[PDB]
Amino acid sequence: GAAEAGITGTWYNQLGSTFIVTAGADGALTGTYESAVGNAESRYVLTGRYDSAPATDGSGTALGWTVAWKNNYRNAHSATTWSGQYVGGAEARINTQWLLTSGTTEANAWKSTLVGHDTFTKV
Amino acid sequence: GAAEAGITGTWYNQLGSTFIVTAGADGALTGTYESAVGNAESRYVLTGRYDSAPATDGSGTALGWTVAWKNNYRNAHSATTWSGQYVGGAEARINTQWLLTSGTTEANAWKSTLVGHDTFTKV
Amino acid sequence: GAAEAGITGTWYNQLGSTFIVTAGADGALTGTYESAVGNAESRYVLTGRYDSAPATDGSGTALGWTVAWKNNYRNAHSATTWSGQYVGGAEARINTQWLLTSGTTEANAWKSTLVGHDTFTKV
Amino acid sequence: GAAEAGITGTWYNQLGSTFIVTAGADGALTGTYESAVGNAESRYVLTGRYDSAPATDGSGTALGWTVAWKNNYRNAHSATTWSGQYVGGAEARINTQWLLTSGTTEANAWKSTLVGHDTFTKV
Ligand SMILES: O=C(O)CCCC[C@@H]1SC[C@@H]2NC(=O)N[C@@H]21
Ligand SMILES: O=C(O)CCCC[C@@H]1SC[C@@H]2NC(=O)N[C@@H]21
Ligand SMILES: O=C(O)CCCC[C@@H]1SC[C@@H]2NC(=O)N[C@@H]21
Ligand SMILES: O=C(O)CCCC[C@@H]1SC[C@@H]2NC(=O)N[C@@H]21
Ligand SMILES: O=C(O)c1cccc(C(=O)O)n1
Ligand SMILES: O=C(O)c1cccc(C(=O)O)n1
Ligand SMILES: O=C(O)c1cccc(C(=O)O)n1
Ligand SMILES: O=C(O)c1cccc(C(=O)O)n1
Ligand SMILES: O=C(O)c1cccc(C(=O)O)n1
Ligand SMILES: O=C(O)c1cccc(C(=O)O)n1
Ligand SMILES: O=C(O)c1cccc(C(=O)O)n1
Ligand SMILES: O=C(O)c1cccc(C(=O)O)n1
Ligand SMILES: O=C(O)c1cccc(C(=O)O)n1
Ligand SMILES: O=C(O)c1cccc(C(=O)O)n1
Ligand SMILES: O=C(O)c1cccc(C(=O)O)n1
Ligand SMILES: O=C(O)c1cccc(C(=O)O)n1
Ligand SMILES: O=C(O)c1cccc(C(=O)O)n1
Ligand SMILES: O=C(O)c1cccc(C(=O)O)n1
Ligand SMILES: O=C(O)c1cccc(C(=O)O)n1
Ligand SMILES: O=C(O)c1cccc(C(=O)O)n1
Ligand SMILES: O=C(O)c1cccc(C(=O)O)n1
Ligand SMILES: O=C(O)c1cccc(C(=O)O)n1
Ligand SMILES: O=C(O)c1cccc(C(=O)O)n1
Ligand SMILES: O=C(O)c1cccc(C(=O)O)n1
Ligand SMILES: O=C(O)c1cccc(C(=O)O)n1
Ligand SMILES: O=C(O)c1cccc(C(=O)O)n1
Ligand SMILES: O=C(O)c1cccc(C(=O)O)n1
Ligand SMILES: O=C(O)c1cccc(C(=O)O)n1
Ligand SMILES: O=C(O)c1cccc(C(=O)O)n1
Ligand SMILES: O=C(O)c1cccc(C(=O)O)n1
Ligand SMILES: O=C(O)c1cccc(C(=O)O)n1
Ligand SMILES: O=C(O)c1cccc(C(=O)O)n1
Ligand SMILES: O=C(O)c1cccc(C(=O)O)n1
Ligand SMILES: O=C(O)c1cccc(C(=O)O)n1
Ligand SMILES: O=C(O)c1cccc(C(=O)O)n1
Ligand SMILES: O=C(O)c1cccc(C(=O)O)n1
Ligand code: NA
Ligand code: NA
Ligand SMILES: [Tb+3]
Ligand SMILES: [Tb+3]
Ligand SMILES: [Tb+3]
Ligand SMILES: [Tb+3]
Ligand SMILES: [Tb+3]
Ligand SMILES: [Tb+3]
Ligand SMILES: [Tb+3]
Ligand SMILES: [Tb+3]
Ligand SMILES: [Tb+3]
Ligand SMILES: [Tb+3]
Ligand SMILES: [Tb+3]
Ligand SMILES: [Tb+3]
Ligand SMILES: [Tb+3]
Ligand SMILES: [Tb+3]
Ligand SMILES: [Tb+3]
Ligand SMILES: [Tb+3]
């Protein structure tokens, strides 16, 4: 469907990170994420979900995905989730907010979670 | 491994929602989510990621997952991501913060995303 | 009014931090905050706002406040804002989410902001 | 000081909202906020705090403020807090994340809080 075809592709955010994703027929997202910043090297697996029958009333398409920051090169003992929506057209965009949680002790849990926002384009 | 065995199971949060999850050998999370609140009925598919080799220095295990709120019964045109950490022991807990994004028009995008926090126990 | 009298007092959160506040007649909050954790020593000035005519339909009373983490003892070059609601009764509570932003370079801005949640009681 | 003089002024965000603020000598922020969106009319009082001795190592200046959405025209029974940092130069900017909490019943508290991000310029 249109949402599947719109989301599937290679995206970059304002940091220069690379988000490569395939949207499955009934709501799955799979792919890889490479961060331009932080305790990260090479590509990391991601999985997520999207609304595979979005409203055709002008609304965006809701989606989210997770990366755990462990691969064959490094392990930052952390995970980021991005929550957002896809907007199509000639200059398609995925607008997100994200939560990055690091494994911490309980005493340090108050400072376990960063929040931010990333906007992705196919350029 | 211990993280995999610790995370895998049936969990409930402070709202009475039900989180059924299986952790895979190298970082995958799969299962179902049923919300006690909101525009939701029955179970929804979830997928996510966790740190499959967490630090054994007393830190929790970082993880995250996504639900897109479409199933055979309803479609709320939204997605939630939970980002958090697993702590084991006799009273194991998953402590999370979450972001729920609804598909909106651009004019309404400023109010597209709710934030909250859920704590899950195996009880 | 009832909201003013309910909010005004000495509160503690789940970390053991101390929140001393006076609510003014038409929406002002003033007082001090002492954190049990982080780069902090002694009391810090806070200011904020609350809804001075909340709905009497069972809803809580919306409020927020800010602390900049500079006083005569230390300066962490950061600020926290708490956003939440007051609920009264015999065991009154202020339930909040918060954002802590540290001054950073632009290159590090992606990791400038922590998010969490604090619940305060008068005990 | 430089931070005080930099922050003080009239700012606008990407929604067209207007943020008029005066920074006081030792950390106070006072002024008014007018939102281009939502349940809002005319100007609302704001108060907040900033780091009045920021690090001069290239870091931004941490700050935050609150608006309770009650004035002589309307009362939305809500409050927003913005948490962020000021960056100066020829094209000065205040980059923020925000939390908007509405008064709700306990049953609806899970959906009490919106999160977003606003960037302000003096243009
Ligand atoms: O440092 C870590 O713990 C792992 C890398 C985190 C990179 C974050 S994820 C959110 C933000 N968006 C990016 O593309 N990179 C950062
Ligand atoms: O209303 C919707 O759009 C779908 C249901 C959302 C339920 C949310 S997800 C975060 C929070 N935790 C829960 O267990 N339920 C709510
Ligand atoms: O470390 C700093 O930069 C200053 C202290 C921050 C303490 C935070 S504010 C949110 C949370 N709630 C608390 O009572 N303490 C922490
Ligand atoms: O609808 C309300 O409850 C009151 C108005 C809220 C407007 C919000 S505050 C965060 C965001 N930034 C803006 O300039 N406007 C919206
Ligand atoms: O049974 C299914 O279709 C299923 C189960 C878990 C995840 C997914 C998915 O991500 O599609 N699909
Ligand atoms: O940007 C960061 O926080 C970062 C980057 C590389 C390594 C580390 C680390 O080892 O903490 N941290
Ligand atoms: O400069 C950094 O990234 C840094 C410094 C100290 C600790 C950590 C960490 O614990 O990630 N990271
Ligand atoms: O997968 C990659 O791009 C990769 C893997 C290891 C090192 C580097 C690098 O040094 O860029 N890049
Ligand atoms: O066939 C349907 O259920 C349908 C068709 C269009 C929109 C929607 C919706 O927005 O639920 N639902
Ligand atoms: O990213 C990692 O896995 C990492 C980083 C520093 C040291 C070590 C180690 O000593 O294993 N591991
Ligand atoms: O080089 C390392 O230390 C390394 C590499 C990959 C994963 C891990 C880990 O999971 O610690 N550590
Ligand atoms: O994984 C890391 O190094 C990391 C993660 C979150 C924050 C920080 C930091 O603030 O250094 N570092
Ligand atoms: O190639 C892989 O192992 C892979 C790719 C995508 C997702 C996952 C996963 O979620 O394990 N694993
Ligand atoms: O809790 C909610 O917001 C909710 C619950 C059921 C339906 C709807 C809706 O149809 O918006 N919304
Ligand atoms: O009471 C509710 O849940 C409600 C009311 C109006 C609109 C919506 C919505 O758009 O979800 N939801
Ligand atoms: O999967 C379920 O539990 C389910 C499915 C449809 C309706 C209901 C219900 O009405 O509880 N429950
Ligand atoms: O063998 C390894 O890479 C290893 C072993 C224990 C801890 C860590 C780590 O925390 O990176 N890494
Ligand atoms: O949850 C849904 O899919 C839904 C809810 C109300 C109406 C419709 C519809 O008219 O399709 N669909
Ligand atoms: O009953 C309905 O309208 C319905 C049921 C499942 C999905 C959808 C949808 O995706 O609109 N709509
Ligand atoms: O899916 C829904 O009905 C929904 C989602 C987010 C917020 C609300 C609401 O505030 O009603 N409703
Ligand atoms: O003019 C006013 O009443 C005013 C102006 C700024 C702040 C406040 C306050 O915090 O009450 N009140
Ligand atoms: O909990 C913290 O991050 C903390 C506590 C004291 C000092 C410092 C510091 O000097 O960074 N940081
Ligand atoms: O352990 C800590 O609190 C710590 C370590 C390195 C850097 C910082 C910081 O920059 O606050 N804080
Ligand atoms: O204001 C206070 O409580 C205070 C001030 C300085 C030091 C300490 C302390 O060492 O507790 N406490
Ligand atoms: O007199 C008024 O304006 C009034 C009285 C009660 C409630 C409300 C309200 O909730 O706006 N407004
Ligand atoms: O909290 C502070 O102000 C502080 C902390 C460490 C060093 C210094 C300094 O060298 O000024 N200042
Ligand atoms: O002891 C210090 O360095 C100190 C004390 C208070 C404020 C500051 C500052 O603002 O740097 N520094
Ligand atoms: O002010 C500080 O020391 C501080 C503030 C935020 C995070 C951290 C940290 O992660 O150490 N430290
Ligand atoms: O005693 C003080 O200086 C004080 C007390 C509360 C707030 C403020 C302020 O916002 O400056 N200043
Ligand atoms: O953007 C909004 O949510 C909005 C705008 C005006 C009025 C209302 C309301 O009365 O809820 N809500
Ligand atoms: O369209 C809107 O803004 C709207 C619709 C229903 C309820 C509310 C609300 O409760 O703000 N707002
Ligand atoms: O303070 C203002 O700008 C104001 C006040 C009331 C109405 C309007 C308007 O209708 O623009 N504007
Ligand atoms: O005089 C001081 O305390 C001072 C001067 C410059 C920087 C700092 C700091 O960053 O703490 N502190
Ligand atoms: O914004 C307000 O105060 C408001 C809005 C609608 C109705 C009422 C009322 O009936 O008081 N009040
Ligand atoms: O016109 C109204 O209802 C009104 C105007 C200002 C404040 C309030 C309130 O606080 O309800 N209500
Ligand atoms: O004050 C309002 O009308 C308001 C506040 C938050 C969300 C919404 C909404 O989602 O309509 N409306
Ligand atoms: Na996911
Ligand atoms: Na404030
Ligand atoms: Tb499937
Ligand atoms: Tb680091
Ligand atoms: Tb490379
Ligand atoms: Tb290692
Ligand atoms: Tb795999
Ligand atoms: Tb709804
Ligand atoms: Tb059922
Ligand atoms: Tb439908
Ligand atoms: Tb006043
Ligand atoms: Tb620190
Ligand atoms: Tb003391
Ligand atoms: Tb100093
Ligand atoms: Tb002062
Ligand atoms: Tb509304
Ligand atoms: Tb006007
Ligand atoms: Tb009214």
Structure description:
- The first copy, chain A, is mostly beta strands.
- Chain A has a single domain, classed as Avidin-like (Lipocalin, Beta Barrel), CATH 2.40.128.30.
- Chain A has an eight-stranded antiparallel β-barrel.
- In chain A, strand 6 and strand 7 form a beta hairpin.
- The interface between A and B is large, with 53 and 53 residues.
- The site of one pyridine-2,6-dicarboxylic acid (PDC) has 2 residues of chain A, from loops.
Note the main attributes of this structure.
Lipocalin; binds biotin; binds pyridine-2,6-dicarboxylic acid; 1 helix; 5% helix; binds terbium(III) ion; 54% strand; eight-stranded antiparallel β-barrel; binds sodium ion; 8 strands; mainly beta; homotetramer; 123 residues
CATH class of chain A: Mainly Beta
Structural class of chain A: mainly beta
- What proportion strand of chain A? over 45%
The name of the CATH topology of chain A is Lipocalin
Strands of chain A, count: 8
Oligomer: homotetramer
Question: Over all CA atoms, what is the radius of gyration of chain A?
Answer: 15 Å
Biggest interface goes to:
A-B, 53 and 53 residues
Helices and strands of chain A, in N-to-C order? HEEEEEEEE
Topology:
The structure is a homotetramer of 123-residue chains.
Chain A: H1 2-7, E1 9-13, E2 18-23, E3 28-34, E4 44-50, E5 61-70, E6 75-87, E7 93-102, E8 113-121
Antiparallel strand pairs in A: 1-2, 1-8, 2-3, 3-4, 4-5, 5-6, 6-7, 7-8
The complex binds biotin (BTN) (4 copies), pyridine-2,6-dicarboxylic acid (32 copies), sodium ion (NA) (2 copies) and terbium(III) ion (TB) (16 copies).
Residues 13, 15, 17, 35, 37-40, 69, 76, 78, 80, 98, 100, 116, 118 of chain C line the site of one biotin.
GO molecular function, one term (chains A, B, C, D): biotin binding
Family (chains A, B, C, D): Belongs to the avidin/streptavidin family.
Protein name (chains A, B, C, D): Streptavidin
